[PDB]
Structure 1
């Protein structure tokens, strides 16, 4: 690895290969080979556009006792989960998702941003998950969610998904999977060459 960040041999000839273009970068094989370079260029942040939360629900859960909803009161809801998303500047937004059982196989989910101190607590249903005769999610698996505006950064709106969520006689409500496509800025830590020839920077 020379001073200009190119992969060269002992004599200085530059190694060539298919370059990566786009966001997220992928190898475009339709282009002519170009010299391979490894810049330190900090990686910018990606505001979230798609988030997913797969969860399993208990059938035997009783309905919340203390109507109405309060994000402060624990006994006011059945479950609470946290998903970390990222805005245009990479700031962390901690979406708290609240599960309240309304009727049989019907679960209202509320969304509240806890990272923004001036955000109002939701009072109306964000979505109503409907589970069929046996866990099988029926409707309401996808909802548009808008972040708060924190420290002048652009609020990131995204589609949050509950696909493949199930509601059966599970012992308790616990989160199975949470994923999101956003990330915060990062600096180059390492580089490697895979057995398929791809150069990957971590």
Structure 2
């Protein structure tokens, strides 16, 4: 239940299911099963549609019932990931060889980042750091979520730090996951940007990130003060969904009262002249609204 009623001039422009056009300052809307914003009589709020990719609102558009679709979005295979680590320059070179994901004294640090394939399966990617000599650290990776994956015997990259402990080379490497339940692997660039070798400390992962996700439910929608309607999604992205139109008449005294505070245009009032809040004839909405799904 949204509330964007108008203490100002301007009317919202509504249509009934037959396309007849009505006007009201009442701003109480519910999102119905048809994915329209409707008043208590079931009339549909109208505005300019969004078109293109990315979707945008054009100046040339016919007002139409606002929709807030409601259709899902696909999954998203990971193509980037990052891990920022602080490594201890005083760490020992492990004496236990060879490196093995199962021998905890064969490496200096282990971290994890969960990535996704196109089907949305999670792959828990384990990342192991093995100090090889002064200022150099071999990095092994392994998809812990794939039982058929070969154990890592060769490093995916080697981090080299300069005398000041700043990352000098080896900080970017393409990784391919294993496969899960017959689905194709993810292939992503793994970045160690902003990783450093401290003069003294304990090996510690400060941050990880990646850009994939599972077909997953999302979050909120809002009406901005220019009447643009935007959806907010759980992938940290947004989509414009429409833009509410306002109407003005040459003679408001001529409008036919329909009861409640709803009105119809007449010969006496003149035709509705349309625009948007915050432009031309119309000032901004007093605030807008924000609603969780």
Displacement of 1:43 in angstroms is: 3.1
Distance 1:126 1:193, change over 3 A: same
Q: CA deviation at 1:6?
A: 2.2
**C-alpha distance in structure 2 between counterparts of 1:24 and 1:90, whole Å:** 24
Distance of 1:132 and 1:32 partners within structure 2: 62
Using a 3 Å threshold, how does the CA distance of structure 1 residues 196 and 173 change in structure 2: closer, same or farther?
A: farther
* In structure 1, C-alpha distance between the alignment counterparts of 2:59 and 2:202, rounded to whole Å: 49
Q: C-alpha offsets along residues 27-68 of structure 1, whole Å, 9 cap, x if unaligned?
A: 899998875422243332100011111111111111111011
Alpha-carbon RMSD: 3.1
Match of 2:128 in 1: 98
Q: Aligned in 2, Cα 1:169/1:26: closer, same or farther, shift over 3 Å? A: farther
CA distance in 1, matches of 2:148, 2:214: 23
CA contact (8 A) 1:40 1:188 kept: no
Structure 2 counterpart SS, 1:20: coil
Query: Could you tell me whether the CA contact under 8 Å between 1:7 and 1:15 is conserved in 2?
Result: yes
| Separation in structure 1 between the aligned mates of residue 202 and residue 218 of structure 2, nearest angstrom | 41
1:143–1:159 Cα contact (<8 Å) kept: yes
1:40 to 2:70 alignment: yes
TM-score in terms of structure 2 length: 0.60
- Distance change >3 Å, CA 165–CA 15, structure 1 → 2: farther
How far apart, CA to CA, are the structure 1 residues paired with 2:207 and 2:164? 20
1:157/1:198 CA distance change after superposition, 3 Å: farther
Post-superposition Cα deviations, 1:91-113, rounded to whole Å, max 9, x if no partner, equal 00010000000111100000100
Q: Indicate whether 1:71 and 2:101 are aligned.
A: yes
Shift of 1:188: 4.9
| Structure 2, unaligned runs of 5 or more | 1-30, 231-291
**Distance change >3 Å, CA 188–CA 134, structure 1 → 2:** closer
Asked which structure has the greater RCO (Cα within 8 Å, sep 6+), the reply is: 1
Q: Which moved more, 1:37-46 or 1:52-61?
A: 37-46
Distance apart, 1:2 and its partner CA: 2.6
Structure 1: where are the runs of 5+ without partners? none
Q: 1:42 to 1:176 in 2, by over 3 A?
A: same
- Counterpart in 2 of 1:170? 200
Structure 2 residue matching 1:75: 3-state secondary structure: coil
Instruction: State the TM-score, normalizing by the size of structure 1.
Output: 0.85
Asked whether the 8 Å contact 1:56–1:170 carries over to 2, the reply is no
Distance 1:14 1:117, change over 3 A: same
Q: CA deviation at 1:171?
A: 1.9
Secondary structure at the aligned position of 2:105 is classed as: helix
Q: Deviations over 1:143-201 (max 9, x none)?
A: 00001111111111010101111111242111111101101112355544466866557
